[PDB]
Amino acid sequence: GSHMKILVINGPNLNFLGIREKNIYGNENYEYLVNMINEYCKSKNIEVECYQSNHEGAIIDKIQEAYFNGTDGIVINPGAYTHYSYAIRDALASVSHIKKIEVHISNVNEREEFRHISVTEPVCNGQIVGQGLKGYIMAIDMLNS
Amino acid sequence: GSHMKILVINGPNLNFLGIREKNIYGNENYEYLVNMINEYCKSKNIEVECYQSNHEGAIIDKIQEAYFNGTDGIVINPGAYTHYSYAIRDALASVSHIKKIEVHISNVNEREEFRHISVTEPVCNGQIVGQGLKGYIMAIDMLNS
Amino acid sequence: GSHMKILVINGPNLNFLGIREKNIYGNENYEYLVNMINEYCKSKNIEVECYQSNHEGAIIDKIQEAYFNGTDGIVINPGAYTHYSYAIRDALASVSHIKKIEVHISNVNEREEFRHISVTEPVCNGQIVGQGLKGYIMAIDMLNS
């Protein structure tokens, strides 16, 4: 379309930014993240929707809806589903014409052992981790490059 | 009841048949599969409902509803949940008077390593894989035997 | 508040108590369990809500709602999600001011191998297993101690 269209998906527990450990996830809340993304995309003439759900199936539904509605790119932080949701992986793989960047706020490589492997990342075009909330901006830049 | 009653459950991403890789999943879409099942069951005087959801919990809800509504048999392709949903496994096991056949379209034994083991199949009465869409017909025949 | 407030969460398949194997799960149904909990808490001047869902995301939603509504303690039997839902684990960890007790009806240590490890228990304050339905009462007593 006339402007790039991006969907940002945040998975379970990410609506509790701020409430969760600030030394891991930073001082700012989910509303702050949404506003940051919205303002950045407006400054770049990018259409963006920020979506969050705790439900694995709703995330898959949202990815499928992106197939039909002109979405060019997805930025996704699957939350803990990153490490086990082969269903979200297959959803991401099913939208073969949508570029996808996986984001994690923290450096998941140095987190608990269960966070070290992502089952969604192998079907994504890229990824970013360990940059704080600005990782979402960096992911948008990867899609807009 | 007067005719056998079957529920066909398709799990996450199976509504994207056709859109997904045709050399894996075949040329035809989910509507085609539903129609194929419906027509076959009509020809055999079998009552059938085709259901699909991306939500693990909705699949479990649907299995539980089958307990109360006279369902004789379930054909289920759990999608990627096959490999990790012990919750769907326990749901299938909980309906001890309902015969169950697991279906996969592709030969999951020769897929990615994560697809090689099914955690749902040990509580099913049978299974079929690698036959394409006709595996669903074969599963119906197993239930109707 | 003026009385302790507890939320009891039962995960997938626990609404099928009674219907499931009685030699594993006991003779009594889910309604019986709810009534038992309600009566006990009334006798102790404890406010309680019993909640059940088969949906991983609804369980997470319910845990998050407990943050905002004055809940003091959660008793949770995550069902099969115990063994794989890092998303429920992170939800429980996110409510750092809510005491949490994990319950299992059966002795999960002597169940199938896949039931031997709980991924939710490391973020709970306690746990109880193998006591039958009275484990829920024991969990309430742990919270009320």
From TrEMBL, chains A, B, C:
Catalyzes a trans-dehydration via an enolate intermediate. The record marks 20 as: Transition state stabilizer. The active site is at residues 25, 104. Keywords: Amino-acid biosynthesis, Aromatic amino acid biosynthesis, Lyase. This is 3-dehydroquinate dehydratase. Pathway: Metabolic intermediate biosynthesis; chorismate biosynthesis; chorismate from D-erythrose 4-phosphate and phosphoenolpyruvate: step 3/7. Belongs to the type-II 3-dehydroquinase family.
